[PDB]
Structures are given as C-alpha cells and as structure tokens.
Amino acid sequence: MKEYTLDKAHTDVGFKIKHLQISNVKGNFKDYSAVIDFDPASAEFKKLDVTIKIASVNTENQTRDNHLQQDDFFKAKKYPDMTFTMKKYEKIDNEKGKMTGTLTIAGVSKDIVLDAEIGGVAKGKDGKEKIGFSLNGKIKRSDFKFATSTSTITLSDDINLCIEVEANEKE
Fold this sequence. Notes:
By secondary structure, this protein is mostly beta strands. The chain has a single domain (about 20-170), classed as Lipocalin, CATH 2.40.128.110. It is built from one helix and ten strands; from the N terminus they run E-E-E-E-H-E-E-E-E-E-E. It has one helix at about 60-70; strands at about 30, 30-40, 45-55, 55-60, 80-95, 95-105, 110-115, 120-125, 130-140, 160-170. The strands form two sheets. Strands 2, 3, 5, 6, 7, 8, 9 and 10 form an eight-stranded antiparallel sheet that branches. A two-stranded antiparallel sheet has the order 1-4. The longest helix has 8 residues, at about 60-70. The chain starts with about 25 loop residues before the first strand and ends with a strand.
C-alpha cells in the first residue's frame, strides 16, 4: 500500500438534497376590455362587464405565457377570452361593497363574489369624472374544472383576483 494526501484544490466533499419551495406566480393581462356603469351619488355599480384576451397573459416569463395557452390550461385556440359579467352590487358603505357576477373560464361559468373597494371618486383636471377602485376575491380552479390535470399539490386550487382600475367618464 501507499499513503496519499488530498489535493484540496482538485477535491470536492460534495452533497445534493432535494427540497420544495412555495412561491406565488403573479400575472396580469395586457389586453382586455370593460363596460363600467357607476353612480357617484350612491357609490353603486350599475353594470360591470369585462372581457379578457387569454392570449395577452403575462406572468413575466415567455415560456410560461405560451404554456398557459395550451390544452392543459386556457386552451386559447378554442376559448380565446375570459368574461366577467356583474349580476348584483350590494353596497356596504361608500368605500366598500360585495360584487356578484358570472365568471367564464374556457367555457365554464360560475357565479363569484368580489370585494369592491372604491378608492377615489373625483372630477378630473378638466371637470370630467374619474374613479379608482379595486375588485378582489379568491376563486377555485376546481369550480371551473380548470387545469384539472395539474394536482392541487403542485399548483394551488386558489387563485387571488386583483382588478385594480382607474377610469375616466365617456364621450
């Protein structure tokens, strides 16, 4: 036998271990339209109808945005848009209310509640009206039979909706 001495410079006492990490995928949609009817006298919404172009999704990642378009997510070839249609606004006070509407994701429709937070009602620079408001709420992938092949372990059943709107009067 012979005796040796490590050469520390070309030696690695190494190890590898697998772990899980939870993180939020955050995203918006670059292209969408809405019809907003609102009465500043009473701080009530009268009509809120939104259409969103699934193709315009943006989760700050090119390959994911594309993947969301595929059969196992949005299926944008067959269902290019998602729609929300308000059915009921129930005023809490002038800053707050409960909005009920029909969300449609890839042809599947469910009534949801969003929390309306009216964050500012004004006449603008020019003397024509503006508003700021938030709509937020949680919907379940499973209520919409959405991405059903992706486990609720990997990707949460819960999606948190945040619609943050600034908006000016018409004509």
